[PDB]
Backbone as a printed PyTorch tensor [residue, N CA C, xyz], in Angstrom:
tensor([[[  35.4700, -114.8830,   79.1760],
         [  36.1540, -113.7180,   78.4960],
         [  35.8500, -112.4710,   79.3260]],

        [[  34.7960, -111.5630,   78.7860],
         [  34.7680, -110.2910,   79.5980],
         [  33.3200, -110.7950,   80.5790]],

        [[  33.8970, -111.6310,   81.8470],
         [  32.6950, -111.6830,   82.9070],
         [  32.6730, -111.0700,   84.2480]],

        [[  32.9380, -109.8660,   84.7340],
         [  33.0880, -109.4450,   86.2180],
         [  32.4830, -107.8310,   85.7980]],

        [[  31.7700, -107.4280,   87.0950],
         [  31.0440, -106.2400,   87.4580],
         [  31.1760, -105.2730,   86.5110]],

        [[  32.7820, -104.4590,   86.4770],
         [  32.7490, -103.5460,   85.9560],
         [  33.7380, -104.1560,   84.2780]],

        [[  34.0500, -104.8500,   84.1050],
         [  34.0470, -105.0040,   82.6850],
         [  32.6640, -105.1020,   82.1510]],

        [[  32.0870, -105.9260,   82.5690],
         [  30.5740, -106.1670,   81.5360],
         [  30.0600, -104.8510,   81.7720]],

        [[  30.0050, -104.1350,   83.2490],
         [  28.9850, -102.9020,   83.7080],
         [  29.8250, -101.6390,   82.2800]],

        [[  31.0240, -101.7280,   81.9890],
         [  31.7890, -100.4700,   81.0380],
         [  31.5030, -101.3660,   79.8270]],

        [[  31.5340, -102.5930,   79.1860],
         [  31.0450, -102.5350,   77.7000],
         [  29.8210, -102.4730,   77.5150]],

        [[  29.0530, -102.4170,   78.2390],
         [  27.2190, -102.1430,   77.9870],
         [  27.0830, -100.4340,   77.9280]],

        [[  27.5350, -100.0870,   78.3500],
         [  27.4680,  -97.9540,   78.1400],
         [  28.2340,  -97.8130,   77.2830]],

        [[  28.9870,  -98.6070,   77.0470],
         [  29.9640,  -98.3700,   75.4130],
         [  29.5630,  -98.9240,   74.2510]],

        [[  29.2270, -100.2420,   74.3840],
         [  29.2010, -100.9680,   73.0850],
         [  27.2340, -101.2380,   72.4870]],

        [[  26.8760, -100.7820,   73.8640],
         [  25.2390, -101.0440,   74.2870],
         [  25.0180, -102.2160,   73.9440]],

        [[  25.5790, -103.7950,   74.1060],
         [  25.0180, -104.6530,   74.0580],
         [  26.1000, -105.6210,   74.7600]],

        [[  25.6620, -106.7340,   75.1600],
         [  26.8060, -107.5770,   76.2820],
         [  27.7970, -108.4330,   75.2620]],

        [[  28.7640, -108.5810,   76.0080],
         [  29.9590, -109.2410,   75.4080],
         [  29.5560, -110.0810,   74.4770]],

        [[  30.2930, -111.5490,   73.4890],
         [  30.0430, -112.2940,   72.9730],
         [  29.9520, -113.7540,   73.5230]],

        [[  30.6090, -113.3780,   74.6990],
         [  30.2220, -115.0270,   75.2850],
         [  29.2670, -115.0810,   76.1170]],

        [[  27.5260, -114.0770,   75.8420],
         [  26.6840, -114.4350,   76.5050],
         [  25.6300, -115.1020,   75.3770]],

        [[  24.8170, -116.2180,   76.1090],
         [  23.8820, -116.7090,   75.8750],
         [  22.6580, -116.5870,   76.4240]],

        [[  21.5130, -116.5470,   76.0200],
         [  20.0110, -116.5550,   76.6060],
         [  19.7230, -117.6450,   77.3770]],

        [[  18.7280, -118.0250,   78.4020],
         [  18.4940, -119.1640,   78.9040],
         [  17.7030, -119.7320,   77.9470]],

        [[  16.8730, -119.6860,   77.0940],
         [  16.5870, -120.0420,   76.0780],
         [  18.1740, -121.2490,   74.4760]],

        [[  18.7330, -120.2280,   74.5900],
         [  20.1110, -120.3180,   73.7790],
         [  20.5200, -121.7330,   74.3140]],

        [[  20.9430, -121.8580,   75.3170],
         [  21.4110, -122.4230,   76.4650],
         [  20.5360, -123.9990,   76.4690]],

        [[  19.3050, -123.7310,   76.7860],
         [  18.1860, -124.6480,   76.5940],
         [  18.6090, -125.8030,   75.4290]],

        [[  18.4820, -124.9300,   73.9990],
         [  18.4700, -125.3510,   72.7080],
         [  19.8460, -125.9600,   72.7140]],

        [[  21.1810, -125.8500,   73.1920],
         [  22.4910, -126.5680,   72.8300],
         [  22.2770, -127.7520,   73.7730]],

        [[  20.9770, -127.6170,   75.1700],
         [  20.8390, -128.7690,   75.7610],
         [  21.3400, -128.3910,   77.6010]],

        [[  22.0060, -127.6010,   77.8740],
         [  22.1230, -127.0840,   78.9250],
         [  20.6580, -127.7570,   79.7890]],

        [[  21.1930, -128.4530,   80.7770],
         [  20.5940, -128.8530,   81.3210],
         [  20.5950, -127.9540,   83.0060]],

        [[  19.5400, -127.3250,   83.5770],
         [  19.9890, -126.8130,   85.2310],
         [  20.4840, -127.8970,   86.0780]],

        [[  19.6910, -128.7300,   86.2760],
         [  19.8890, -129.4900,   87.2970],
         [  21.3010, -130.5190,   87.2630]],

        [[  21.6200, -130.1450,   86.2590],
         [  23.0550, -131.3650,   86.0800],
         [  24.2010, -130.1620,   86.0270]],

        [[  24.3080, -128.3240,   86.3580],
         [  25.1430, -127.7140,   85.8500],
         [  26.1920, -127.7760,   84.8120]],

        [[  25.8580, -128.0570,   83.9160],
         [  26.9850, -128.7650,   82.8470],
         [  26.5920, -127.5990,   81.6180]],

        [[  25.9560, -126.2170,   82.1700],
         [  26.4110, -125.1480,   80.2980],
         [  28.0860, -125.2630,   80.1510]],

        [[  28.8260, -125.2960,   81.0610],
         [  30.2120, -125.3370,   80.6780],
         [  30.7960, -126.0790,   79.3720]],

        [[  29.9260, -128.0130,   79.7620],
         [  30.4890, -128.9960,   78.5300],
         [  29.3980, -128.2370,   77.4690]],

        [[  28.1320, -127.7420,   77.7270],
         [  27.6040, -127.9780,   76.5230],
         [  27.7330, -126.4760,   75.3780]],

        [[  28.2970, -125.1830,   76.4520],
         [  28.3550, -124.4430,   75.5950],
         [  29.3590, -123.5140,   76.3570]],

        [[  30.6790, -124.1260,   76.1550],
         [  31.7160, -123.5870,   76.8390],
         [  32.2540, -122.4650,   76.6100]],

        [[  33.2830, -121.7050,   77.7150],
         [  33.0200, -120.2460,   77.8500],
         [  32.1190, -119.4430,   77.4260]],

        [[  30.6310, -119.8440,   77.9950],
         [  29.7330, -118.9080,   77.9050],
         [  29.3080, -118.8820,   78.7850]],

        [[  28.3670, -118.2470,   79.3610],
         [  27.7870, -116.9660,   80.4700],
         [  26.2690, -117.4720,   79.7890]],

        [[  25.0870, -117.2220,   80.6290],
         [  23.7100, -117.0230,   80.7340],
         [  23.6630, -115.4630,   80.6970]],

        [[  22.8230, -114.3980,   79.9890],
         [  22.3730, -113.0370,   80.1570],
         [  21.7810, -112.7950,   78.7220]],

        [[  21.2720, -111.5240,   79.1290],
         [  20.4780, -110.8660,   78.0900],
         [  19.1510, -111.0570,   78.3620]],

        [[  18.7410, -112.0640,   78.8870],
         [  16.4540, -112.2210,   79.3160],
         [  16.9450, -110.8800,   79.8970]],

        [[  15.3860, -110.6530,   80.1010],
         [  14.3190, -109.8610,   80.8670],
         [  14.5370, -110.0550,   82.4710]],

        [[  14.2820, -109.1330,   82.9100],
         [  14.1020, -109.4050,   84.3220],
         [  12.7690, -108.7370,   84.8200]],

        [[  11.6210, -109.4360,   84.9570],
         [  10.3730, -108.5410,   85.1530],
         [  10.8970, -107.5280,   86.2610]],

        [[  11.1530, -108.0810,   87.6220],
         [  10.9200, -106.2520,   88.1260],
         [   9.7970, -106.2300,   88.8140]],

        [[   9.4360, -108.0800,   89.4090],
         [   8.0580, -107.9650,   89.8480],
         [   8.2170, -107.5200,   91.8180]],

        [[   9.2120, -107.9080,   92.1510],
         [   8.7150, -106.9640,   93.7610],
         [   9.2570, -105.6360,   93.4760]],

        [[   9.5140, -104.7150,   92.4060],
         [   9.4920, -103.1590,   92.4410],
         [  10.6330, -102.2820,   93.1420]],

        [[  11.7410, -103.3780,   93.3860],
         [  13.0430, -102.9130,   93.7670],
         [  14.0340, -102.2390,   92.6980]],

        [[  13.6690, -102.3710,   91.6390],
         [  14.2780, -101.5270,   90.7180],
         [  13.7640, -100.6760,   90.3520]],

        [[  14.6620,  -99.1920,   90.0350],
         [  14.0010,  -97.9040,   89.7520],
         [  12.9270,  -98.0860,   88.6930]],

        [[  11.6170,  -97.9630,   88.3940],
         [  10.6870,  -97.8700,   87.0550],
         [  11.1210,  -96.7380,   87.1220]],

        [[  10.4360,  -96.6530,   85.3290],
         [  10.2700,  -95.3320,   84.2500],
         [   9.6770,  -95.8930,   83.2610]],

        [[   8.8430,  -95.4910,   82.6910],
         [   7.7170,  -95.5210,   81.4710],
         [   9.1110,  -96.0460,   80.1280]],

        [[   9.0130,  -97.2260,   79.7080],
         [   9.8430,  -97.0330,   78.5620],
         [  10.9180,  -98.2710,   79.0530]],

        [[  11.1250,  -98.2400,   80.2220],
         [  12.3310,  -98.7200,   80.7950],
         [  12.1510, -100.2560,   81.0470]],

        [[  12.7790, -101.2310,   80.4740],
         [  13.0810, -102.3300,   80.3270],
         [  14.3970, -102.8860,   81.0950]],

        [[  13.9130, -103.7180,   82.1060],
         [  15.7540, -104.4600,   82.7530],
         [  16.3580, -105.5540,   82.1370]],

        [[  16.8650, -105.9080,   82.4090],
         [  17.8310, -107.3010,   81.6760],
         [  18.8770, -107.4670,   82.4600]],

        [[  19.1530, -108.6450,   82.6170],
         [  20.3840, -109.5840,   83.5620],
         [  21.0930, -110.2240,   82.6050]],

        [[  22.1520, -110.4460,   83.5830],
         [  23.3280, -111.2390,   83.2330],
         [  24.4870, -111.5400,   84.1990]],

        [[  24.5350, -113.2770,   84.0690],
         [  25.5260, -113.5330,   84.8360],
         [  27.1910, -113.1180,   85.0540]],

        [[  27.3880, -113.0610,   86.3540],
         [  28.6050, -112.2660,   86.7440],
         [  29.4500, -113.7750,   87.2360]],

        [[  30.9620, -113.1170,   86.7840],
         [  31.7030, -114.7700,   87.8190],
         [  31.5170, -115.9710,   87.4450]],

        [[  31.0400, -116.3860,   86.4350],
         [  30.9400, -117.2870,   85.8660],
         [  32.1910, -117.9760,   85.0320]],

        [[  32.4650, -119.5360,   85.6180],
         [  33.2830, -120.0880,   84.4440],
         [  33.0790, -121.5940,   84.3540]],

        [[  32.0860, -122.4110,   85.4910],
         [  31.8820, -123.5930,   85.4050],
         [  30.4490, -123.7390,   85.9740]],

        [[  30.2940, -125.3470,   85.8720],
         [  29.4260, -125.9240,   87.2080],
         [  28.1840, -125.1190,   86.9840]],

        [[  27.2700, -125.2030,   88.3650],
         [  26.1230, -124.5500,   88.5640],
         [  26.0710, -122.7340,   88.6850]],

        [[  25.1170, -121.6840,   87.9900],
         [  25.2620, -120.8760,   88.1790],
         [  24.9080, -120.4010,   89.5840]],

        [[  26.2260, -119.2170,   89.9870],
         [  25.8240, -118.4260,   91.4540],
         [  25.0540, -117.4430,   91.2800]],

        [[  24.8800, -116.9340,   92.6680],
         [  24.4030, -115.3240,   92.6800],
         [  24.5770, -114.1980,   92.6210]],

        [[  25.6480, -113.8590,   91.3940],
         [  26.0320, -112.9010,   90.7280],
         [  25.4360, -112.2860,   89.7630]],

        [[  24.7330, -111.2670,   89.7210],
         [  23.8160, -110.7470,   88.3310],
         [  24.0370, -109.4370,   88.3490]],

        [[  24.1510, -108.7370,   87.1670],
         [  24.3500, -107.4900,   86.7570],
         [  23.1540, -107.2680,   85.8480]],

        [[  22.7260, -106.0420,   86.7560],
         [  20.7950, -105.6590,   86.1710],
         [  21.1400, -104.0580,   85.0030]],

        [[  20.9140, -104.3230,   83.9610],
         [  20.9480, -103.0340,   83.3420],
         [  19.5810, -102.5740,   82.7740]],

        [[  19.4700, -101.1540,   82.6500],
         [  18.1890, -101.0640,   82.4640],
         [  18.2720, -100.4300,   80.5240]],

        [[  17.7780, -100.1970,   79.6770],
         [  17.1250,  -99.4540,   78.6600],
         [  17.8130,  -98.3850,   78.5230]],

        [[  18.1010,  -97.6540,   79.1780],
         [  18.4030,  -96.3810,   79.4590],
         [  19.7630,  -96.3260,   80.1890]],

        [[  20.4880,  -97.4120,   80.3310],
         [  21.7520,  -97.8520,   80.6240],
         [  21.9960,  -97.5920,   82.2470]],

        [[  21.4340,  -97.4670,   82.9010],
         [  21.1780,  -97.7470,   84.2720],
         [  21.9690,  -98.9730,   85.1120]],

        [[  23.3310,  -99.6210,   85.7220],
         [  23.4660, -100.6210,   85.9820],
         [  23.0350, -100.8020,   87.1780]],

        [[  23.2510, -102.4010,   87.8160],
         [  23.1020, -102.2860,   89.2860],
         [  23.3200, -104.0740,   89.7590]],

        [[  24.0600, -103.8090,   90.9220],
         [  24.3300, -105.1710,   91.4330],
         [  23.4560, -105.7300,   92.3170]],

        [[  23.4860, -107.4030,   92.0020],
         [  23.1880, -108.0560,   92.9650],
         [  24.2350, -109.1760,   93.3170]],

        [[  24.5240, -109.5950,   94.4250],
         [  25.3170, -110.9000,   94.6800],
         [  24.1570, -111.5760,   95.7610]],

        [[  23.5420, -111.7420,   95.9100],
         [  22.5810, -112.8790,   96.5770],
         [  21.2490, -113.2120,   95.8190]],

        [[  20.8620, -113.0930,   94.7550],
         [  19.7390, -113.6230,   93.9120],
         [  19.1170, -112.6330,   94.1050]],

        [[  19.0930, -111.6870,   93.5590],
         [  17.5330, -110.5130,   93.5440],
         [  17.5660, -110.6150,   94.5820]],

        [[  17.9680, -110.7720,   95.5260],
         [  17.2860, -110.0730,   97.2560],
         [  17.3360, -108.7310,   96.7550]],

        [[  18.8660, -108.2540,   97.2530],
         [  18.9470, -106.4860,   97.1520],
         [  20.1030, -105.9530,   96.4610]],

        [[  19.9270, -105.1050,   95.6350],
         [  21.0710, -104.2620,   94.6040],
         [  21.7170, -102.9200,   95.3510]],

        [[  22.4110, -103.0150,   94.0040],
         [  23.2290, -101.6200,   94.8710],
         [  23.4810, -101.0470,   93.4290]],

        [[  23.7980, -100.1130,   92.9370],
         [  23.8480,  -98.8730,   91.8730],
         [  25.6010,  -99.1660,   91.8190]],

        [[  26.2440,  -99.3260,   90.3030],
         [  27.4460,  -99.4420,   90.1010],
         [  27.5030,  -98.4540,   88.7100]],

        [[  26.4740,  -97.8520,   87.9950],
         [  26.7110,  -97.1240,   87.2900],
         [  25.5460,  -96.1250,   87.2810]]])
């Protein structure tokens, strides 16, 4: 439904929370989503992985006292997930990655 950069990056500063076809990796877990077989598609179709935490442990994202990140998959509609993630922060901060957390870039 709503999965690419700047749709998800404009309903999170609007609606402050991600679309309805995201699930937790947790969520995901529990319907049985298995990683290694890519199959969230059969088990919990048109949905997306987002909403965890993203610690923030090599310090490439802006800190601030207060400030909490969170991901969510971008480009998603089958199969195994890619390296598309959209990082928002607490304070509505967005920011891209397309290669796995290597390196972001500021989209809002």
């Amino acid at each position: 439904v709503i999965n690419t950069f700047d749709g998800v990056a404009d309903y999170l500063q609007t609606y402050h929370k991600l679309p309805d076809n995201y699930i937790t990796k947790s969520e995901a877990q529990a319907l049985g989503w298995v990683a290694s077989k890519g199959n969230l598609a059969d088990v919990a179709p048109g949905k997306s992985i987002g909403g965890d935490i993203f610690s923030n442990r090599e310090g490439k994202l802006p800190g601030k006292s207060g400030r909490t990140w969170r991901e969510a998959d971008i480009n998603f509609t089958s199969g195994f997930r890619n390296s598309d993630r959209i990082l928002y922060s607490s304070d509505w901060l967005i920011y891209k990655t397309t290669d796995h957390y290597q390196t972001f870039t500021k989209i809002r």
